[PDB]
């Protein structure tokens with residue numbers, strides 16, 4: 001149970017984005033139905049009044065929280081991966097539009113899931129803004145909590161993989177467009193009951209065997225991190 005509070009751009013806090021530049025849902029409950037329209041941008045997908053200006057190559061940091069800013073972030077039980085996707089905003093997230101910029105699942109070196117490291121990072125994970133066409137975009141940050149993912153939601157709707165989905169409105173101003181954005185995958189649609197990484201038993205199956213759901217990270221993607229960029233306590 002987690003939500004995005006706002007974003008940072010090059011370590012500069014853009015301020016509380018909830019219902020402002022984040023298409024915030026009404027609460028932190030997960031999406032679990034893989035064929036739900038709610039898989040696009042969570043249960044209240046609509047245009048919000050602001051879009052955060054960035055340039056290609058900026059560090060864009062998403063900041064999550066549980067109940068209040070810079071708290072426990074997400075229950076520690078919620079082990080799983082983190083991904084970020086991008087789509088042109090005029091799509092409203094519909095159709096074959098979502099391109100993956102970032103994946104972090106289980107780090108064998110550290111013996112930790114992405115969610116574990118997100119807690120340590122005070123809810124902060126970042127991407128490099130890619131060199132796509134200037135314009136308005138949706139950045140779809142997705143945490144998958146796997147603590148009930150041994151079941152398919154379609155078999156037992158009390159369980160299933162849990163999707164914490166947050167769409168941020170980002171405007172890319174300065175970009176050379178050296179990596180034009182291709183078509184991508186649909187949400188809902190990209191994840192199905194047979195997709196690797198959707199049904200996974202963290203109690204019985206080693207995390208060293210976990211394969212995150214496709215698609216693969218796009219060749220145009222410039223990377224990211226799970227790390228505290230900004231100190232909310234200094235404000």
Ligand SMILES: OC[C@H]1O[C@@H](O[C@H]2[C@H](O)[C@@H](O)[C@H](O[C@H]3[C@H](O)[C@@H](O)[C@H](O)O[C@@H]3CO)O[C@@H]2CO)[C@H](O)[C@@H](O)[C@@H]1O
Pocket residue numbers: 001028066067074075076077078147
């Ligand atoms: O026992 C089932 C699993 O529970 C997990 O805790 C979640 C609770 O089930 C859920 O009721 C609670 O929801 C809170 C939410 O956290 C809070 O922010 C909001 O204000 O109110 C909701 C209640 O209406 O969320 C927790 C997760 O934080 C356990 O984490 C899990 O191990 C356990 O299997």
Ligand SMILES: [Cl-]
Pocket residue numbers: 001
């Ligand atoms: Cl839960």
Ligand SMILES: [Cu+2]
Pocket residue numbers: 001002075078
């Ligand atoms: Cu939860």
